[PDB]
Symmetry: D2
Subunit: 319 residues, 4 copies
């Protein structure tokens, strides 16, 4: 039987006997992701080049997600990669959920048309205070729903909740997300590692050894493959689909990494664990880091459990 994103979210909400506020959130996000897809694919670009003859793509992305979330009446605190301060929804539009999002990750390399994506995480608000930036300061464990949209060769929405990870394919002919992978689970061990090897000069001693273990296996088994798209959503999804390990580790120059905990690492960490993988900073789980700043960074290693554990074995070996 066919299933859509909207109908699927409605069914799950009906099972749990919820109020519909989260479903109205998820549907609003779905509308915003489709408008980003249409724009990322350059619909109407002929008008920019004068077939008769405006905002830039990350500005438009932020406006779409922001405006769809406010007008969902389901949110109260919004954190975006693009805004210094969390946005507190006006009282007339306030709901109970805190959404942290990256409206367009990978945007640095969109001029070469490589894959980009939207990342989001949803927390129920826990305090009884007036809403503030503080409500966004929850660990990833607290996530109610998380996921990402990947605008690749086709457009897919990957949704993670307690019931598992599900993947939805965008059908541009009808503007519908079609359920194509139910309850996905990552391989126990993979054949690909993903990290920017151009910066090997700054690699932590552990990272140097583990990557050395993948290219020059001690037993002389076959080497792993290397892939690095450079757009976080693309690398993590390939890791989910094919297994393997993705690394953005900390080094001496960047003791807490470069990727952002609230709207890059946590949503991705939440997807990985619900699909049976791991996600660590090296010292602890990403979902266990408690942030003190909504834009603070975290190092992240994620993927198949057997690969992330071998990294931890090597990492431990260097203290």
């Amino acid at each position: 039987d066919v299933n859509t994103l909207t109908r699927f979210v409605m069914e799950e909400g009906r099972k749990a006997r919820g109020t519909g506020e989260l479903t109205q959130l998820l549907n609003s996000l779905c509308t915003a992701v489709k408008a980003i897809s249409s724009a990322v694919r350059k619909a109407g670009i002929a008008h920019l080049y004068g077939i008769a003859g405006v905002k830039k793509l990350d500005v438009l992305s932020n406006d779409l997600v922001m405006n769809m979330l406010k007008s969902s009446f389901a949110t109260c605190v919004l954190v975006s990669e693009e805004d210094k301060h969390a946005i507190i929804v006006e009282p007339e539009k306030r709901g109970k959920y805190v959404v942290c999002f990256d409206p367009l990750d990978g945007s640095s390399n969109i001029d070469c048309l490589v894959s980009v994506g939207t990342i989001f995480g949803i927390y129920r608000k826990k305090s009884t205070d007036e809403p503030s930036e503080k409500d966004a300061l929850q660990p990833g464990r607290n996530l109610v729903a998380a996921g990402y949209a990947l605008y690749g060769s086709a457009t897919m929405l990957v949704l993670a909740m307690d019931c598992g990870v599900n993947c939805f394919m965008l059908d541009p002919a009808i503007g519908e997300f079609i359920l194509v992978d139910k309850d996905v689970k990552i391989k126990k061990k993979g054949k690909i590692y993903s990290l920017n090897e151009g910066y090997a000069k700054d690699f932590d001693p552990a990272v140097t050894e583990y990557i050395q273990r993948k290219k020059f296996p001690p037993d002389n088994s076959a080497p792993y493959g290397a892939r690095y798209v450079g757009s976080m959503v693309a690398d993590v999804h390939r890791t989910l689909v094919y297994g393997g390990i993705f690394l953005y580790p900390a080094n001496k120059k960047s003791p807490n990494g470069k990727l952002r905990l609230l709207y890059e690492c946590n949503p991705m960490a939440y997807v990985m664990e619900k699909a049976g993988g791991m996600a660590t900073t090296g010292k602890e789980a990403v979902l266990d880091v408690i942030p003190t700043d909504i834009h603070q960074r975290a190092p992240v290693i994620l993927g198949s459990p057997d690969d992330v554990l071998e990294f931890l074995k090597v990492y431990e070996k260097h203290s």
Copy 2:
């Protein structure tokens, strides 16, 4: 003034006072490219999953059929066909088309960027057309380029007049000229290759890569990017500069990429854009193939990076 792929080709063909045969060939390719793009973005996938109750095979069918019915071709070589296809006599034209209808599709399970690559030759002589008409060196190319089905769909066309970049506007199904007479940066800051095969690397490749991470002159290291889909990596090299490598080693002494419909069109585009493309031993466009599916090693990109690689390669005798 606004310009499209279709009008652009007509204007050039009218300039050169040609017969219109290549303009039709290109028009058919472009039509095939919009259909591949439509299917790759999974339009109608809702019917596959029962809303009312293969992709490299389809791409091939689209390109084969649009070229056959263009009446401009006589020999077609595809990654997907073991043997060349000879156009029916009543439909024969004067051109040979080599193509990979959808490269990267083996990893389309992760929605990686994929693309269509093509190169066009004039056939060899008024005899019966044959596979030998496709055994020309890349120097002979009349036109080459690629379609990239990435975050957006772009068609890159290289001819004697240079390299031009056309963006597909899906709202109207038209290719819009957005980059006129493209030229690659003289030097870039990114290198692209699967470092997982380091165990098999040639000394020249090992040394050259060591130079990218650990610069002798103290300058900043290059960044690494490797999508694993040749159209996606090569296009990034064109737009951003840098170097792309799939070199020869001892286990694959002639490489992995295919000479006719992967390497030659991309070297042709590169040279036309001011870049270089080498086998290590010689220019890609100078290899004379003896098999339509033969492979070649390829290093292509910004001239100073390809020249810097060649110095190391020369240095290893």
Copy 3:
């Protein structure tokens, strides 16, 4: 502030504190409407014509399957099926849906406007579900409306809260709310009927039209419009005011339009928008059907025009 069909339906459903079954019906229907629109605008027609070497049946299959799978329905009535369709036990919900999946499809050869018509009833009896559950008068409708595949694709939804119009944005595949709480003009300037049956017109119909061409008060004559596709004509009536007529004639002594899945939904839209809809003897919404494909005469449109027709009808005893 922006609003979509889905968000509008959910907000209304949450206001009334319902279970979500009707909302799930509406979402499934909306999905089928977008697939029907895609097919009516001929997406993919190139593959029908061999680029790689019936419409009303698909419309019915899309709706049947999207409604079955909503778990919200138990009896389905389609213009395309002789007998009512009983949903299988594991998929049963409490709603009865009568619909024309593609009305006007007979003249789709000329690219005339076509449309989808639907009415939604809560099942009223506690018996095993059967064809009998669809024989309710239009007064009982919970929701009704239509999709017009015209110059653009618009969905018109009528409920207790009134009539709302949603324009399909094909760039993103979402229905956008563009007209809130729509209400028809009190009196209009256009009449709509197939004047080819004039030889068979009842005297009341002939006279009322004579008043439109030759106004007794010297005012301007009404304009005539008759497209021949009921969704197109009624929507023009809704948007511009005026009157639409499909009266009884000799080949159609009980009228021609179907009461269940054409007249009732349109009557419901009209009344909820402040218009009228009559058979001549009584309101369309008060007719009690005895057969799922039975016909009825219908005069509908602006309230002053329908009342002007009714006075003329009364005068003829």
Copy 4:
């Protein structure tokens, strides 16, 4: 074998051994028509309604700009511009184009079918271009046609080789040839005119319509259809046979439709399809215009129907 509008036109142009100027003009119109199709179907309307917190003017601008930039024209006459547009010398080509960029757009609020009508003349003298280059009779037309934005989007192209109909596949932004060399029925069963203005009908028009509703013989009355959008009624007339009338009366001694860009392009399609088109006094294509916006009466459609009309017309003369 599949065929597109672009490939078909190139084939016809290569056959005739023309310069390619008309092919560029025709190819520019096609791109303009698809952009009009995108806007009429309301792509991007969600941005207009604030998702991120003109139509006949845009239609005119798309055609004007695409034709100017085609380098194929020198004089442009539009329903939307008081004076002919003279192309700057560096963009001048040999053709004069007359057009209604969006006919029927007055009633587009109701999502009625709308359309684009065009006629193409070779300029006849070597003088500096002026309005006088557009005052040629329709006999002189080199190509004419219309785009219908109906349930789907179709392009109807008429030339000396005949009339051909192309369906836009929106999935790929391509016009697919679906009806080659179409010819109208010798006689039809539909008449089309605004009968609401019967008070103003010429006595001849009154009688002929009376014969259609009340056939003097045994046959069945004709059916009536009137969309009120000229492109839709004429196209239905072409596809189904019959007659379309916007005739002259005493309040409008020269009719209402404009000769250069409404009546002539439609007369040309009709004659090329084997139909007729008359003002009552003479063939539409024979009128010598003296003003670029002058009006003409027009009766067109199936030949036996127009001849029967002319017999009645002669009777009152």
